[PDB]
Write a protein that binds this ligand. Sequence first.
Ligand SMILES: CCCCCCCCCCCCC/C=C/[C@H](O)[C@H](N)CO
Lengths: 60, 238, 238, 235, 285
Amino acid sequence: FCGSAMATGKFLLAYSPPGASPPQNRKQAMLGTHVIWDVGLQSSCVLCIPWISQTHYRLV
Amino acid sequence: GLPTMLTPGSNQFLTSDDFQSPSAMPQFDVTPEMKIPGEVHNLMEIAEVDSVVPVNNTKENINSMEAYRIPVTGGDQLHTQVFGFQMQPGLNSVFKRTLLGEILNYYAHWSGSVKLTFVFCGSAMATGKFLLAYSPPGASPPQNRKQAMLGTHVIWDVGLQSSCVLCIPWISQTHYRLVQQDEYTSAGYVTCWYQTGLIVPPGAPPSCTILCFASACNDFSVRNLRDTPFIEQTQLLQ
Amino acid sequence: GLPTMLTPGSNQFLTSDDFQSPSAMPQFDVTPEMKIPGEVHNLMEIAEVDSVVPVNNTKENINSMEAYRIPVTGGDQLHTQVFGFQMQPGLNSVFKRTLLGEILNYYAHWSGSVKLTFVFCGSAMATGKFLLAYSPPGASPPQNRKQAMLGTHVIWDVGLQSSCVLCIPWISQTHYRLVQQDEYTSAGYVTCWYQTGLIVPPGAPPSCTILCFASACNDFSVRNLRDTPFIEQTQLLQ
Amino acid sequence: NYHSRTESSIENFLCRAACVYIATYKSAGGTPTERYASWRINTRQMVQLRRKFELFTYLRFDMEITFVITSTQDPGTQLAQDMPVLTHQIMYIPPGGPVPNSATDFAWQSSTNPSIFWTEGCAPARMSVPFISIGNAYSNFYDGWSHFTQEGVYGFNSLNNMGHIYVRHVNEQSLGVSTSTLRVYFKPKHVRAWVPRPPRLSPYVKSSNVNFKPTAVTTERKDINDVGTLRPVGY
Amino acid sequence: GAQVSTQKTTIHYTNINYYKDAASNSANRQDFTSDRVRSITLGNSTITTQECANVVVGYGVWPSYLQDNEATAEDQPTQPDVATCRFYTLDSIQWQKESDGWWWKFPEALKNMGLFGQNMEYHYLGRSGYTIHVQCNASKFHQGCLLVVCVPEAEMGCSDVEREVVAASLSSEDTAKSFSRTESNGQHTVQTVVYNAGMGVGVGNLTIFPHQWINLRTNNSATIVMPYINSVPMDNMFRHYNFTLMIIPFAKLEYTEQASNYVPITVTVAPMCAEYNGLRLASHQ
Ligand SMILES: CCCCCCCCCCCCC/C=C/[C@H](O)[C@H](N)CO
């Protein structure tokens, strides 16, 4: 987060697996794996998107 | 058979007794024991949990939520008294519906040390010092800071730490003071005065709100049991 | 002599007591003991013996003997429900005059697993499969076989074996459910559906009769005792 | 620091017998509902015990029930002139039992029910009952409906299934008419209390739910820094 | 038999039990004496709270399973450890100056999110501990305070006396019901005044129930790890609310002219060790 020191906020970043349709509202995103990041407490929150796949290798 | 003699106290119904009695459901097994969390053992463990005290208990304010928020305006005052109350945990309007008071109101006598923790709800940049002084019963309430300084006091830096706590000491002629305190077995006044004056920067709002939490210290005791003069009824409610 | 005090509970006549009393026939010898067979020890041993349940308890049928015989007509149905009843062993019309119910009706609370054994009285050559499913209280009674399949069920081959038995399981929020079951502490519906359709050869009659036997499994218990609301009187009968 | 708590325990706060019900029943012919007096077993009728229970969410105790049955003489004519002692019968009815419609009924035999016969001029009758419920705790608050489709009653009035105490006279009283009053007292012992919760600020208005009117927090004092009185009330 | 003990002032007392029932003895009445932040990874969705922040662990106990020592069920089908443990995020309530308060009812507030509303819609029983984490993005010029509290069995009184309450007014589906600073005039709604907290108790006395403060000066978020509290070990989640969140601002938020005025509040609960029993082919709605 490149922002003023005094700024504070929380963002939910969610990796939704292929399943059905893209998340369109926060309630849809909450079910999928997610991290709540407090911008004020820490900048640079990191999400390690997990490897969940039918095959060992996915074509580029 | 055995030639007993019936002493006085026979065929009576003293309420606070401990007698045996035959069972109406004989050989009745019970449901087995489960571990519900929060198994309290003594009632005074409810009087060790802080409950906000309505310090601004003015007539218009009591009905509203704004009876728990004590004003700490920023400016040059240096004489204004933020708050003052007789430290009577049982009768005083400030502490009577607080959790410490409600358990205490059930019990006639109170002995221990009360702890008031005053949190500061204000902008991070705000900085100020307040002197909170417990003046013992002595003579007259503190009316200027110089009068308050003599009595036991703590200087709290709002900026360095929020939540300064004052453990009001137990100084009393008798081991126990009645919850309905009289001039005898009464308790001293508690008051708070500005030390430096709140300094709030241009970007933050000048006014701030301070709240008061009251819970008994570990050494608190009750001595008797009585009806609570807070709840009543008229008929058998149906 | 001994200065006793008469506690509350003196000069009373509690019925479910256990007190000593002086004898009216002193030094009266008895007839010696004989070993009559069938010495029952506990009352629940009567509730472990099967008693036919009147499953076809329709208004015209109850007066007649034809209330114990459940119809299993042969043909292509595949939707018809042979029987369905809420598994309330105490209030339900089906189980209340059965032996399990009569002992149970004496006791207020019931906890255990009921067993229904459905015998097939039919020609040796007949063959068919029936799905008997205990649907737990959940939502609504099973109305088609696909709804019944989800709930616990047993497929019975009438030809391979007569007398298939379903031990309805004890799944309940509380350890004990009141015999007068309410919506709370109630029990799930039990239903039976055709799987293949009875196949009866030309030489045998197409219709057949299935009967239901109900007895508690070993783990059954009662908790309280009360008047049976089945028998009454008006005056001292002479 | 040698001022430890003994009378603040969960026993001594709750091992005191509080009055729970006030009945009234006559002993004359006509109006047969005036002969007996029924009571479904709540603790929510009288307030003085109700506030002590509604500090904790769940409870589990054994109880000691007692009755101070006193009687008067009804005014009018055809009075007794002389009167032997009159005995009372207190019958517990379990949940799901047959209740008597009136006095001198067929169902007053009480073969299974724990009836108790009490004579006047004696000590008050006493019995002990154990922890009797289907659940594991007497829940004082049940935030939930009865039916799974969210209808029916709401509140604590779904797990209070404790049956009724039906009291009657067992004398015919050929000449006179005389009422009697029943006062039930509950003294719970071996008490365990789980999940404490605040006292009820508002007054009680019902015995079915937690209805209330919005009351003030505390009483009003003069100012923010009012210390009460500086001298006595004189001058 | 023939016991001797002490009394509260040698002096003793010899009391015997003359009865064959455990509930017929007397009462006992005697005692025998750039920066580092922690990241909770539960399921497949993390959070970032603070290094310095305390986490309130319920009523002392951590949420755990229901062992075989205290089970009364007949058969016990499987409980998932990944499928229903994610940090589900609910709708974002908006904090203004004169905002009264908000509440939730969590066994009937997760019925649409994930599989937690797809397991309890089928099974009869249910049991789950919760790991509520409520956050609001802070700044140094945005003074104000907050109180969260998970009150268990929060029976709420109706607005009009001699009425019951309706399920549409007690809980909501995705929204948090407001807490009128005044008194509701409804005929079937809830008595939603803010200085009595719905239940009729004093709103200052909500600090017994596990509580945490989201004071904007010294705290950004708050995390309460509530345990499953119920008398019966298993009860259905559609006709019973296990507890109730209550977010009541004790001090109103006061910004300045050149400052942001759309400060949000989100709640990010996550069921821990959710168990189910009694599979019935129902599909409730
Ligand atoms: C001696 C004859 C009368 C016997 C009466 C039977 C025992 C009395 C019932 C016990 C009452 C249990 C304590 C309270 C139960 C419920 O949880 C509360 N009413 C909650 O509303």
